[PDB]
Design a protein around this ligand. Structure first.
Ligand SMILES: CCOc1ccccc1N1CCNCC1
Length: 185
């Protein structure tokens, strides 16, 4: 791909974070803490999952960013509507306002309903996310494998402003403590 030139500087929005998340001072890294992080509750926080949004809102244009997933066992990445449900249980689907891929139990899947199997020969350590608002496209790239395509959602119905979306995953195993990191441009 030649999408790198639409690079945007993403930072994480503390106010949207699940109360167990720890966001770095520079707002570029997030990990699961071992306990509640001593913040007050608010209507923006994701309550059932270790999720957080980017601060940036997009309603037009082409945008690209990269995320480091090194040594993680489980995570979700992509974009979502600003108006997604924050409280209780829900599935990641375009019908619910999410355009995502994930790693879970040694397999990669796209968050369609039902989910779609991904075919990745080189497990990625960094993922590139490309959004073309006008075209209705969200694409995922394997930076570890020379930028090879992972998945494209097309004919997307964004239906409002979009925010970068992250899930660091639980750490029931003791093997998923590593952070998600936004990579430099
Ligand atoms: C591990 C302690 O639990 C959480 C920690 C952070 C977010 C959600 C949960 N729950 C929500 C209720 N179901 C169990 C996990």
């Amino acid at each position: 791909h030649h999408h790198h030139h639409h690079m945007v500087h993403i930072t994480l929005d503390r106010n949207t974070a699940n109360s167990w998340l720890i966001i770095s001072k520079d707002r570029r890294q997030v990990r699961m803490g071992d306990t509640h992080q001593n913040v007050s509750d608010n209507k923006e926080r994701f309550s059932n999952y270790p999720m957080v949004l980017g601060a940036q809102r997009f309603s037009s244009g082409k945008m690209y960013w990269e995320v480091d997933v090194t040594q993680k066992e489980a995570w979700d990445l992509g974009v979502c509507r600003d108006s997604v449900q924050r409280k209780g249980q829900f599935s990641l689907s375009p019908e619910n306002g999410f355009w995502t891929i994930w790693l879970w139990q040694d397999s990669y899947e796209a968050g369609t309903s039902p989910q779609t199997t991904l075919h990745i020969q080189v497990p990625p350590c960094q993922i590139g996310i490309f959004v073309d608002y006008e075209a209705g496209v969200v694409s995922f790239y394997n930076i570890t494998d020379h930028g090879s395509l992972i998945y494209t959602f097309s004919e997307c119905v964004f239906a409002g402003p979009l925010r970068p979306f992250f899930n660091v995953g639980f750490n029931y195993s003791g093997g998923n403590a590593a952070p998600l990191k936004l990579c430099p441009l």
